[PDB]
């Protein structure tokens, strides 16, 4: 897929998603909200989305990720909602990996109102 | 797919979920985990499972949602799990978008007791 | 999937995922992060990975899992990022549902340089 940006690293064949890197410092007192830059901006593949979900590292600081869906048709930049939810700061160092993103199939249904048994 | 009721909304072949209105209105205080009704049943199609997922709109408020699993075989109503993270108070009003749910492939195995090399 | 261990739960058909177990009694304080133990390791199906999300009875009580990417090349302890990210102090005993686990197909793609139209 084409990607625009070097927010976001090649990943082995064994590994499910992708680095992202964080486009510039980010400073998070506890119970703060902040929309992280990565830089990127990609072309999915038609028929697939794009799951941003955490790392470990980052996870186990007390830090999560809210939000996570990339719809096929954006083209914006990609964003990372953050939140510590920890009871101490924390600072990300520009370009650290915050999170990944996982490209998962797409089930389009048509919804029919009726009864479920 | 068959569903009842009209807390979810028919979406785009472009877009990876469908969106989730909240039934009542909600007010949680920081902190707070509070089982908001959506009105809707479905009858999710065999062989997928239904993610609940959040909308970047609300994660951005500091709202998370927990949970997050319909089994294929549920027929009850989703309920979505959210939870105020953040350090201020917040009120979601009624039929106020609060989620997406993503419809995704199921596998099974069957579990062998060996040794994992 | 071989499996090695007995934190992990056999599933029936209908279901997304295998309930994982605490491997001992874990205490959280409002805001603690801990990295709770299952004592299970899995071989996951080439071309597959493992998401770890959380249950509603858990996530009713304010308890959230963060990272819970398994990728399908690991092969140590399967381990649950927990924080409790309510305001009142939790306590899950040993050999305790705390998650779930939900094996999901694998995209590799070619990071190209381009431009996103
Ligand atoms: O964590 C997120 C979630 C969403 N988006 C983007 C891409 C989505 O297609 C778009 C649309 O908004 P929502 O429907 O996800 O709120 O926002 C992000 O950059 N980061
Ligand atoms: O956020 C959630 C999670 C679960 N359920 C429902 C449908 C699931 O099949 C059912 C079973 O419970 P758990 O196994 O997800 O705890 O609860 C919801 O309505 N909302
Ligand atoms: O919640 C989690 C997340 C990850 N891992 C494991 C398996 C992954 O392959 C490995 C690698 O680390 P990350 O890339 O997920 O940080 O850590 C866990 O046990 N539990
Ligand atoms: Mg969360
Ligand atoms: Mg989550």
Do not use: F
Request: glycine share 14%; charged share 25%.
């Amino acid at each position: 897929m084409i990607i625009e940006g070097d927010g976001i690293l090649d990943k082995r064949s064994e590994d499910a998603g992708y680095d992202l890197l964080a486009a510039k410092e980010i400073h998070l007192l506890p119970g703060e909200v902040k929309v992280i830059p990565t830089g990127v901006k990609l072309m999915l593949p038609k028929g697939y989305w794009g799951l941003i979900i955490g790392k470990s590292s980052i996870g186990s600081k007390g830090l999560d990720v809210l939000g996570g869906v990339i719809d096929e048709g954006y083209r914006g930049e990609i964003g990372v909602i953050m939140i510590n939810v920890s009871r101490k700061s924390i600072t990300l160092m520009e370009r650290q990996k915050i999170a990944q993103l996982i490209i998962l199939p797409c089930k389009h249904e048509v919804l029919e109102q009726g009864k479920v048994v």
